């Protein structure tokens, strides 16, 4: 059945995103079982993103030629098996756990690249959009459920190992159901022209800034709140609250952005970059207040997280509109792929590691006590507002050349034919 295929693939995506953030929710515990520092605890996410980034184009290449059901099932089976077998590593071996993260990255890259094509080819011009929307609205839900599941199982069983064993069972089940309920099924001349398009380049830099901030914050906040609450001498509910909040900010941001853009398109033809830039600057103003409120109050930190969280996600669905506003129809396949790769390279490939590295560098030159353990991370997370302000400036520089770029595109399209 077609509805069964859509439902099973959507559940697969939710399970896909639940398995990236079960490591953040137990980060504090890992740093005691293996005897590492912040430098060592950033690598667990840095290597994951590097492997995913390099794997994705190859699996896109493969998924055109060969059986797709075979490749999806093999990917799910592989990363479920590796995730399960990773929870037995002895204490003396830390590099093995980093290798495990690399392998899980490969396994998820395969599925994330291939599933949208299978959903796309089943449906027609009208109902395809709704099915893709239901597919993509599994990102906030799975992301939050990662924090909640990890912390809850660790709370229940009493040993963080158990947070790495609940998911592989559900992986194995769906890996077999995706074999039963689913029905079967020069790029250089583009690069020489996509680097003279100023709106395209500036939009790509702005999206990279968004990725930097999102990756760093989304890995490091739950631990920083715990350190702050230890300093106040009034203290794993923090990760539960963070998951509950993110589950709803994900949807609210996108609704807000679409509404504002739709209204502003009937006043001028520069609506998309202006809305994006205003949202980025507001989010920077509100983000820079957590690192001040948390020294005094805790509920203020949560409210600031809510507002900045919401305004940082508003430009999620408007960058695709910019890309198809300024690029002619026979270069969009190349443009999307190059943009996504570059977003990962300058984004959160090496962001969490850098935060941890700076925290340790600050702390080695000062007495190591809980106060300075908290203050070092506080003063190392100042780099998120700075790059968000850069992102706002880049969206303004996009809005400066938007119209001339559209005019060039129309001349090319009508000349070619």
């Amino acid at each position: 059945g077609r509805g069964a295929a859509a439902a099973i693939l959507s559940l697969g995506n939710v399970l896909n995103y639940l398995d990236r953030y079960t490591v953040a929710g137990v980060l504090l515990d890992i740093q005691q079982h293996f005897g590492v520092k912040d430098r060592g605890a950033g690598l667990l996410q840095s290597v994951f993103i590097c492997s995913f980034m390099v794997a994705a184009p190859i699996f896109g290449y493969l998924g055109d030629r060969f059986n797709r059901k075979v490749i999806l099932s093999c990917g799910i089976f592989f990363w479920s098996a590796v995730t399960f077998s990773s929870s037995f590593i002895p204490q003396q071996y830390f590099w093995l756990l980093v290798l495990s993260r690399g392998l899980v990255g490969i396994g998820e890259a395969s599925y994330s690249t291939i599933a949208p094509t299978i959903i796309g080819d089943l449906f027609t011009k009208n109902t395809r959009t709704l099915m893709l929307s239901v597919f993509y609205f599994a990102i906030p839900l799975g992301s939050g459920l990662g924090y909640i599941t990890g912390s809850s199982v660790k709370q229940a069983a009493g040993d963080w190992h158990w947070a790495l064993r609940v998911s592989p069972v559900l992986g194995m089940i769906t890996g077999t159901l995706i074999l039963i309920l689913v029905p079967a099924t020069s790029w250089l001349r583009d690069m020489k022209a996509l680097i003279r398009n100023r709106s395209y380049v500036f939009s790509s830099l702005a999206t990279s800034a968004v990725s930097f901030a999102t990756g760093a914050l989304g890995m490091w906040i739950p631990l920083y709140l715990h350190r702050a609450q230890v300093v106040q001498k009034t203290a794993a509910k923090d990760s539960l609250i963070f998951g509950a909040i993110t589950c709803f900010t994900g949807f609210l941001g996108v609704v807000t952005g679409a509404g504002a853009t739709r209204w502003c398109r009937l006043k001028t033809q520069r609506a998309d970059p202006l809305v994006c830039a205003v949202g980025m600057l507001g989010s920077a103003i509100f983000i820079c207040l957590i690192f001040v409120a948390a020294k005094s109050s805790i509920v203020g930190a949560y409210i600031c997280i809510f507002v900045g969280e919401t305004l940082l996600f508003s430009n999620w669905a408007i960058t695709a509109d910019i890309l198809m506003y300024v690029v002619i129809p026979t270069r969009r396949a190349t443009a999307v792929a190059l943009q996504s790769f570059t977003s990962h390279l300058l984004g959160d490939a090496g962001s969490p590691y850098l935060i941890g590295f700076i925290s340790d560098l600050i702390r080695q030159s000062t007495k190591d006590s809980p106060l300075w353990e908290f203050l070092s991370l506080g003063y190392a997370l100042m780099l998120c507002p700075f790059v968000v302000v850069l992102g706002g400036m880049f969206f303004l520089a996009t809005a400066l050349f938007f119209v001339s770029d559209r005019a060039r595109a129309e001349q090319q399209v009508n000349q070619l034919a």
Partner: nanobody, 126 residues
Framework: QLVESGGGLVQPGGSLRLSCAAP?????????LGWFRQAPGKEREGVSC????????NYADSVKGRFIISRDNAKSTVYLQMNSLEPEDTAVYYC????????????????????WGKGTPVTVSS
């Protein structure tokens, strides 16, 4: 919505001029214009379109050399000048606005338009 004006009863060899306007202070300049038609026995088909910045116009194969489309976004209007009408031009004419660029072989596609009008009929007598 958008609003269409004009339309009526003409004789072969006549001429006609239709207009489309946006009531209010709405500007309709992001992308805004094309003209479509529908007849009793058949399916809707694009008749012509005009572009956002340059003033680049496209027509279908059956109306080339007779129709002319033009834009004026100081006052938010668009005009269609029809000439040399013939008994198989009898239909209802519509006005639409979407986002894809202006190109040939984009005319016929009407499943990706943001705003539609309500129609104005033209009858060519004998």
């Amino acid at each position: 919505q958008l609003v269409e004006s004009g339309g009526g009863l003409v004789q072969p060899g006549g001429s006609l001029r239709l207009s489309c306007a946006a009531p209010g202070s709405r500007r309709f300049d992001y992308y805004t214009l094309g003209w479509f038609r529908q007849a009793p026995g058949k399916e809707r088909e694009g008749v012509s379109c005009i572009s956002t910045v340059g003033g680049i116009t496209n027509y279908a194969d059956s109306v080339k050399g007779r129709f002319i489309i033009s834009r004026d976004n100081a006052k938010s209007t668009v005009y269609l000048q029809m000439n040399s009408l013939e008994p198989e031009d009898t239909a209802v004419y519509y006005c639409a606005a979407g986002r894809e660029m202006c190109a040939p072989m984009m005319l016929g596609d009407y499943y990706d338009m943001d705003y539609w009008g309500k129609g104005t009929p033209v009858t060519v007598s004998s």
